[PDB]
């Protein structure tokens, strides 16, 4: 539902992969952890795992 600027971090919680996201046009204070199923950013995810 919102445009993602970049993935900052990744973690596993409750057996779910989650990404810490910086939302485009929003302050860092709005960064939130979102389960991977919530994302439609294959490019960013792909790039994150790559440079990881």
């Amino acid at each position: 539902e919102y445009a993602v600027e970049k993935i900052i971090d990744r973690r596993v919680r409750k057996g779910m992969v989650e990404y810490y996201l910086k939302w485009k046009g929003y302050p860092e204070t709005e960064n939130t952890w979102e389960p991977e199923n919530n994302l439609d950013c294959q490019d960013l995810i792909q790039q994150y795992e790559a440079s990881r």
């Binding site: 539902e1 919102y2 445009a3 993602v4 979102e34 919530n38 994302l39 439609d40 950013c41 294959q42």
Partner: peptide
Amino acid sequence: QTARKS
């Protein structure tokens, strides 16, 4: 691209 905000 985009993402759902839980």
